[model samples]
Target: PAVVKNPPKLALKIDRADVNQLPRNFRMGSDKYVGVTKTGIMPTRKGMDTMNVSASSCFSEKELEAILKKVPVKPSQFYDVDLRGESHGYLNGTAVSWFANHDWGNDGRTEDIIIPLEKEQLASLKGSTVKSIYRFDDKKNVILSPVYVNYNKVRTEEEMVKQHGANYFRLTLQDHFRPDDPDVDKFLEFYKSLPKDAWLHYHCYAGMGRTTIFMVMHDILKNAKDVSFDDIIQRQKLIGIVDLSEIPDKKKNYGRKAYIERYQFVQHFYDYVKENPDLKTPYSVWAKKNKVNSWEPDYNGYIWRLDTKDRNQLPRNFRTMNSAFRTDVNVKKTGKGFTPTPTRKGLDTLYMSGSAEFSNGELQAMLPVLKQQAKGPIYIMDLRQETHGVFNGNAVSWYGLRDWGNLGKNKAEVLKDENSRLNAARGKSLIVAELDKDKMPIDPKPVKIESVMTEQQLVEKNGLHYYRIAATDHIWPSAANIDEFINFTRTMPANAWLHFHCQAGAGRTTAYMAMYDMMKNPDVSLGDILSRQYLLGGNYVAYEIAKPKPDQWKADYYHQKAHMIEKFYQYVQENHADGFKTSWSQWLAA
Candidate 1:
């Protein structure tokens, strides 16, 4: 069995004068001034759609002359149009055979007439009737109208025509094109209610712009398959109603641009219709759905959608919503060694995380993958207070802290307490000392010490190395300090490997990793980074755990930090021209 659906039969009744005034190269104000009727078949839609004919009942002889020059109707052919068994109304033009020709008026003379048809006489009319009046230079020969139809009060097409016993109807439309407006809604609703066999005639002051918009709508409604505005626009252009391809001089008073812009607007309206096929007025519904809080017109004529309700003038795509990628977790267990999660494609950074169980076994396991994939200066940041000091190819133990708490030292007594660990392990340590004003090592160690403000070099060490950050455990770095951290991380040479950990290697490590990622790529969205973090190890890094504060483990804590990073991004975007003199703290405060 085959499935089928019924739609309406649509038609347009446009004044010949309006169709002739269509522009060949340019347009403005819906063709109020341009009038060039390029020779071609009178534009028409394909299939059962009929192009009903009508003209304004009130134009002068001179107007008809100009109209005849552009339209296909010959003055002598008026008598050939029959009105018997047709419908007529005083809404615009007359459909009778007698008034079809222009010869009813002499040269240099114009006439307007009101003719009335009785119900009996109207019943005898057939096909379609045009509402018309007779105009002559002489007044004595005037025909007294028996009846006239009122166009001001619009009714159904059947009711409109049945009152006069005509076969056709006229649903009044405004002079300008507005398929999305309220007036068009009534007509469209009535149109959709009609049987597929019915024909419709639509017209405007001129018939092109307004008529074309409705025609596009009707075509889309009648077809079962989805129809695009581009298809409709091109078809109308082919039929001589609109031509968006031709370019006109900018200095001229023409409206090619206006027409194209309107066409694009209508295209958007069409998209809404396609999106919500069940709606009666898709445009109105769409407008309600996307209510404008404020609209800012940019340097160009384009309008930018802006949310006035929020301070972050960023568009929706750039704004971060709380519920977008949030996850809830409750379980925590002791995990294994360092696992390297590669940065997204094109981002030349590696992220490594681990539990306190990290050792030579983990490093050896990660080395082959690292050597194969990492950009390597291979700096291991021991956030765990005491550095493991060495990785002798396959073994290691954490030594006591230099001055801070060695939170992860399994054997608290190990104090570099042996032969050269670096020489054996083939790696060295670079200490980030947070010394007081005296500049003395709080827990005296013979190693290279660097100020937290200076950047680290990108040279390779014998094996594993360390870079200590001067900050409290499980707390955010000060903006100034974070800037230095960012700078320090960025100065590392290309293809360098950096590993960071504090005790369990979760909170501060993750925060620093996030900071480094943001510094490396300011344009990256916080949602993307957060989502990537979620992928690597769930929300373990996003929330603080060790000695967690009230708000420390909350999802918002990470979001707030990400927002600060976003602020940094915005600052970079705006101040890039100013040599980016602003600091991260300054941007965050601003």
Candidate 2:
């Protein structure tokens, strides 16, 4: 392989506003961080491979010098880690081996504080590595420790002892940002025994999440007695740490439980200090014989989706009790769509919820539970796109118009279909919602109602009907899809039972149910119909389209959805009496 010269000029740009919102040393992206601003933990290679290149061997001295000079955060996260009365401001997160080996010095920011790294003469860090805190030769190196990763273990106590002897303390922490139960005790104990004089250095891969956790904990231990816990957190935030507490809706992938657990642990520790001013009790002892590893994430600690990435980390069970069966509609609250189980108005035989895969079992549990309400041939209207869910260890993606599923479908084509559908909609639709040029979709898929003329029945159990209608998620279905939904509704036999479901069995499921209720009970106000869905078991699906989101794309996403829902409401009111006496397709075409 050809070695590319002039190291990739990594983008280090940060907006001041965004910087204020984030920690000073925060992750720029998943793989990169502001190392000095954010210490980027170099990702490990395949087992046995190590980045062992040193100044003497890897390159001619001049070449290595030039490359190292270009490194964005050469010092890598040295800051004032002020411990209660610990005298001099603390040093953190730079590898001591690098300092021992190199002549590096001075963060561009300051000379006195940074010790000009390499140039500031200490008891001459000559040939051998600065291996132990016991040497205490340079007060700065007193708390420095190696971040060693051996066979998946990150500087386990053994590794630290191997270099600095057992007297020097080191505790292993989970890189996922969640610490093991016993390790938390060890972590709690480490800070309690530390001397006041040494400038401490601590590090992890990306000195962002885990390092941030430790730093925040250190602040809590040292200052919680005098300072407000809120100030301690805010100060840490100003320094640039991802808040592991509160629901983070951005840049989130895996490790949600890790974040929550870390947050809860910090608070519990804070509470401990208030109770025991002596701080003698270990965190676990203080905790109520705490339950550890409680959050068994369904998606391998990952947020699962129909996308090509992380396919192996998808959901195992569609347990309604946990995710789907929830009827807690977030009316004015801040939850995404989670709606209730509803029965139809006229037929009184049809029912809807999220997805059946969301059932507690392999079979749609509602079928047997609602068995007393109606007769046989239990019908299932699977109103999800390929991206919504899974079934029997496989993705629930059989429905769609031609090759129109997320797995293999081209985005250009899907956008084409969505746009086309919007254009054909008799109700209000967006060519592109009012948004910036970069945020807008170029020519999305048009709503084609003709899908009903071609798509066939997908599955038939001995006493069941499985029908698939591919509807996009996170927004309103194309009006064509709505027309097809109406067609499905009109064609249902009175004796047959109908069950509607989508991914999570909430938004799409509730939307169709509400539409059905409106179509049958016209005199009922749209407000009443929507409120009933929530009262029955549905999210406040009717969000104000005009509300701003974190940014443009999202705002537009909801705007389009909310407008289409209003259009559906309008359709039901105008045509329920006509009863597709005129098809929505014919009515809209005219």
- Please report the candidate that would top TM-score against the real structure: 2
Tell me the lDDT of model 2 at 343.
33
Q: What are the per-model C-alpha RMSD values against the true structure?
A: 29.7, 26.0
| Model 2 global lDDT (CA atoms, 0 to 1) | 0.42
What are the per-residue Cα lDDT tens digits for candidate 1 across 184-280?
Answer: 4555466556554443433333345555565556555554144345554455455435454333466233355555545665665566566667655
TM-score of 2: 0.34
TM-score against truth, every candidate: 0.28, 0.34
Instruction: Put down candidate 2 lDDT per residue, 464-560, tens digits, no spaces.
Output: 5767666766556656778887887778775555566665555677677677767767765656666555565554556554444444333444444
Candidate 1: regions farther than 4 A off? 1-357, 384-465, 538-581, 585-590
Q: What CA RMSD would candidate 1 show?
A: 29.7
Clashes of each: 34, 42
Say which candidate scores most in lDDT: 2
Alpha-carbon runs more than 4 Å astray in model 2: 1-331, 334-356, 359-364, 387-459, 545-547, 586-590
